[PDB]
């Protein structure tokens, strides 16, 4: 009764493959490297006296 | 060939090249010149007539 009237039919697919490139030709990831520079400065601040 | 693995049959030696070389120099260029040029002489003398 549950299998009553069900068809199966194959579609399609899809192929997983890679390129050997012996030769190479290919881009790919970058490295490379960067500088940040800062700098940090020194006030002065209200003085203490004595008379 | 790809230039950074060595082969011997997607290359075969340097002798296929030297014969590939040698049959075309030697063969079919000459038997065409042959007939080329008998067919030349045909056309400009006719047959079996002797210029001065």
């Known amino acids: ?51 | 060939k790809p230039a950074m693995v060595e082969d011997d049959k997607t290359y075969p030696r340097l002798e296929a090249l030297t014969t590939a070389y040698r049959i075309q120099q030697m063969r079919n260029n000459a038997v065409t010149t042959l007939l080329n040029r008998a067919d030349t002489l045909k056309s400009y003398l006719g047959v079996g007539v002797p210029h001065p």
Do not use: C, H, W
């Not at chain 1, 299998?3 to 490295?31: D, F, H, K, P, W």
């Open chain 1, 1 to 51: 009764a549950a299998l009553s009237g069900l068809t199966v039919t194959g579609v399609g697919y899809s192929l997983e493959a890679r390129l050997t490139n012996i030769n190479q030709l290919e881009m790919g990831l970058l490295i490379d490297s960067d500088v940040q520079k800062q700098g940090f400065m020194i006030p002065t601040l209200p003085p203490l006296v004595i008379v």
